Amino acid sequence: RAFTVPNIPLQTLSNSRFPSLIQGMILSPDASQVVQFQNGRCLIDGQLLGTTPATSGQLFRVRGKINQGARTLNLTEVDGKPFMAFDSPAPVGFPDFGKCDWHMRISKTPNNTSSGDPMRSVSVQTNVQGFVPHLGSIQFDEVFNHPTGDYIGTIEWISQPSTPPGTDINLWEIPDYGSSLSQAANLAPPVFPPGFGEALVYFVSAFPGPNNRSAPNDVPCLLPQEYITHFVSEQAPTMGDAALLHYVDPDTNRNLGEFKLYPGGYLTCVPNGVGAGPQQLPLNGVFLFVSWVSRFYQLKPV
């Protein structure tokens, strides 16, 4: 099977850390930034990593059982199937937003009622002892004084982490999935700055909530979700050190820049000095696979 990427403009594609349109393409503000996102991780031959779902349907959802008067949500997969702990860091699609407090909205499922607002607000801190999704559970800030059941929902907005007090949201980081006695199994590995003039490319979307900068909370990810779905469906074997892509303006067929898509499921480019980079490019372009290339291929600067 010949390798391809989706023929859809970037601005129409989706973030792979939460369902939303991509709103920007950037380099990390810190050139030394290492990332270890658990969602939006897929080998370009269609092998999912970490907690990454094949599609957006499963992405950024939380499901579990909770008892009336408890603080603990005992996680399942999003479809209600048991979560097999000690295999994965968390259920498939579980949020990977580190260094923030989560303000979630959940409801008891399925509906078995003829009236009533089913929505419940709960808050989750990610650096506390009770945040142990790898062990199958997360702890809410307050006792859950609502009916026992199977609850499903998502993070509605985020805010600064409660501890250490005064620290800001940092969406470049992931939460601590493991416990004091056990580290999380099968975490998607870290992705390091490639060096040799190359820099990692991140796709960003804004997420609701405050921060210390009184600015949008921007969520970086490594791949559009549609790319992941495409790779899972296509299962095209990787035949080079990297896939060479052109970012093409579909209005003119003009090549706006060269990028490498590595087998590990991330993109790089070579910025043409400070001030240059993919953030200078329009967001209506389409990536096009050109050729497999070796490790000795030097990208033309963007």
Ligand X SMILES: CC(=O)N[C@@H]1[C@@H](O[C@@H]2O[C@H](CO)[C@H](O)[C@H](O[C@H]3O[C@H](CO)[C@H](O)[C@H](O)[C@H]3NC(C)=O)[C@H]2O[C@@H]2O[C@@H](C)[C@@H](O)[C@@H](O)[C@@H]2O)[C@H](O)[C@@H](CO)O[C@H]1O
Residues that bind ligand X (CB under 6 A): 101, 115, 117, 141, 159-160, 162, 165
Rounded CA separation 27/157 (Å): 25
- Tokens 């199994």 locate to 185
| Least gap, CB of 158 to ligand X (angstroms) | 8
* Residue 39 partner contact from Na ion, its own copies, ligand X, none using kind-dependent CB cut-offs of 5 to 8 Å: none
For residues 21 and 205, the answer to whether their CB atoms sit within 8 Å is yes
The token pair that represents 90 in the structure block: 């968390």
* Residue 141 partner contact from Na ion, ligand X, its own copies, none using kind-dependent CB cut-offs of 5 to 8 Å: ligand X
Nearest residue (CB) to ligand X, 88 versus 160: 160
* Residue 14 partner contact from its own copies, ligand X, Na ion, none using kind-dependent CB cut-offs of 5 to 8 Å: its own copies
Rounded CA separation 99/222 (Å): 19
What's the first-to-final CA gap in the chain, in angstroms? 30
Helices (H), strands (E): how many in the chain?
A: 1, 16
Nearest residue (CB) to its own copies, 135 versus 171: 171
For residues 34 and 193, the answer to whether their CB atoms sit within 8 Å is yes
Q: Which residues pair with 89 in a beta bridge?
A: none
Q: In the window 21-40, what residues touch its own copies (CB under 8 A)?
A: 21-23
For residue 96, state whether it binds Na ion (rule: CB under 5 A). Answer: no
Among 96, 176, 226, 258, binds Na ion (CB under 5 A): 176
For residues 8 and 286, the answer to whether their CB atoms sit within 8 Å is yes
Give CA separation, 35 vs 45, 55, 59, 96, 181, in Å. 21, 22, 19, 12, 24
For residue 64, state whether it binds its own copies (rule: CB under 8 A). Answer: no
Nearest residue (CB) to ligand X, 122 versus 270: 122
* Residue 162 partner contact from ligand X, its own copies, Na ion, none using kind-dependent CB cut-offs of 5 to 8 Å: ligand X
| Least gap, CB of 128 to Na ion (angstroms) | 7
**Per-residue interface string for the shown chain with its own copies, residues 91-110, x marking contact by CB under 8 A:** ------------x-x-x-xx
* Residue 101 partner contact from ligand X, Na ion, its own copies, none using kind-dependent CB cut-offs of 5 to 8 Å: ligand X
Closest C-alpha to 125, from 112, 105, 113, 141: 141
What is the dihedral angle through the alpha carbons of 69, 72, 74, 77, rounded to the nearest 10 degrees? Answer: 110
CB-CB neighbours of 168 under 10 Å: 12
Residue 86: helix, strand or coil by DSSP?
Answer: coil
Nearest residue (CB) to Na ion, 12 versus 139: 139
Q: Which residues pair with 76 in a beta bridge?
A: 82
Q: In the window 196-225, what residues touch its own copies (CB under 8 A)?
A: 206, 208-217, 225
**Per-residue interface string for the shown chain with its own copies, residues 229-248, x marking contact by CB under 8 A:** xx-xxxx-------------
CA dihedral sign, ordered 147, 148, 152, 158: positive
For residue 116, state whether it binds its own copies (rule: CB under 8 A). Answer: yes
* Residue 131 partner contact from Na ion, its own copies, ligand X, none using kind-dependent CB cut-offs of 5 to 8 Å: Na ion
Residues that bind Na ion (CB under 5 A): 131-132, 176
Contact positions vs its own copies (CB under 8 A): 6-8, 11-15, 19-23, 53-58, 78-79, 103, 105, 107, 109-119, 156-157, 159, 206, 208-217, 225-226, 229-230, 232-235
